[PDB]
C-alpha cells in the first residue's frame, strides 16, 4: 500500500498527528526532557503536563532557514505579519521546553524583520 511507503521514505508528520513518533537516542544526555518532565511531575504537586507537539530533533533549524528569508510559516503561529512567535508546545528531546523556547525566540525576532521588510516589496 502506497500510504505506508511514503511514511517510511519521508520523515514522519508533525503538522498533523497520524504518524508515530520518535524522541529516542542512545546517548544519556539526549533524553533530557523525559527526565526533566518526570522531576516536575513529582516535585510540583500542581504540575500541568502540556499537550506537546513532539518534534523531530534538529529540524527546528530547517524552520529557522525558511523563516529568515522565504515564505510565511503556517507551522508556527504568527499573530500578524510584523509579529513572529513561536508556539508553546515545541519540544526537542535533548533540551527542556523552556530552554528550547529561548533560542527559537531569538531567531523569531530576527525573522520578524525580514518578513516585515518583505511586505515593503512592491513587485
Amino acid at each position: 500500500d502506497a500510504r505506508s511507503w511514503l511514511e517510511q521514505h519521508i520523515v514522519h508528520q508533525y503538522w498533523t498527528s497520524r504518524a508515530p513518533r520518535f524522541s529516542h537516542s542512545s546517548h544519556l544526555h539526549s533524553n533530557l526532557s523525559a527526565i526533566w518532565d518526570q522531576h516536575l511531575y513529582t516535585t510540583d504537586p500542581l504540575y500541568t503536563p502540556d499537550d506537546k507537539t513532539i518534534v523531530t530533533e534538529t529540524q527546528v533549524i530547517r524552520e529557522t532557514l525558511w523563516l529568515l528569508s522565504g515564505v510565511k510559516k503556517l507551522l508556527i503561529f504568527q499573530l500578524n505579519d510584523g509579529k513572529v512567535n513561536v508556539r508553546n508546545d515545541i519540544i526537542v528531546t535533548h533540551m527542556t521546553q523552556n530552554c528550547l523556547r529561548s533560542v527559537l525566540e531569538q531567531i523569531a525576532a530576527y525573522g520578524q524583520v525580514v518578513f516585515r521588510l518583505q511586505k515593503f516589496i512592491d513587485e
Partner: protein, 109 residues
C-alpha cells in the same frame, strides 16, 4: 461501500490496514442505524445556518466569501445530495477556542 468505509477508518488513524477492524465494526453499526435530521434537503436553509456559524467565531470575511463559493459549487456540479454534504461539514465544524485538553494523560484514565 465496505471498501470505502474501511479506507475511511485506515486513513484517519493514519495507519492500521486490518487493525482498525474493531473501529470499523462500530462504524458499520452507527451507519446501519437511522436518523431523522432536523432540516431535510433544500439548499437555502443549510447556507443560512453556515453564515450564522461564521459570524459567531468572528470570521465575517469568510461568511461573505463562502456565499460566492456556494454559487460556484453548484455551477460545477449538481446533485440531489448537495445538501447532505453541506450539513455534513456543518456538524463536523471545529471551534478555534480553548485548548482541546491533553491527550497525553487523558488516554490513561
Amino acid at each position: 461501500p465496505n471498501v470505502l468505509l474501511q479506507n475511511l477508518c485506515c486513513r484517519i488513524l493514519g495507519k492500521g490496514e486490518a487493525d482498525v477492524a474493531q473501529q470499523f465494526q462500530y462504524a458499520v453499526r452507527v451507519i446501519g442505524s437511522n436518523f431523522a435530521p432536523t432540516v431535510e434537503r433544500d439548499e437555502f436553509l443549510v447556507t443560512e445556518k453556515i453564515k450564522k456559524e461564521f459570524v459567531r467565531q468572528r470570521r465575517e470575511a469568510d461568511g461573505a466569501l463562502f456565499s460566492e463559493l456556494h454559487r460556484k459549487l453548484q455551477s460545477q456540479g449538481v446533485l440531489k445530495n448537495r445538501w447532505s454534504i453541506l450539513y455534513l461539514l456543518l456538524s463536523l465544524s471545529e471551534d478555534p477556542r480553548k485548548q482541546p485538553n491533553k491527550t497525553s494523560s487523558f488516554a490513561a484514565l
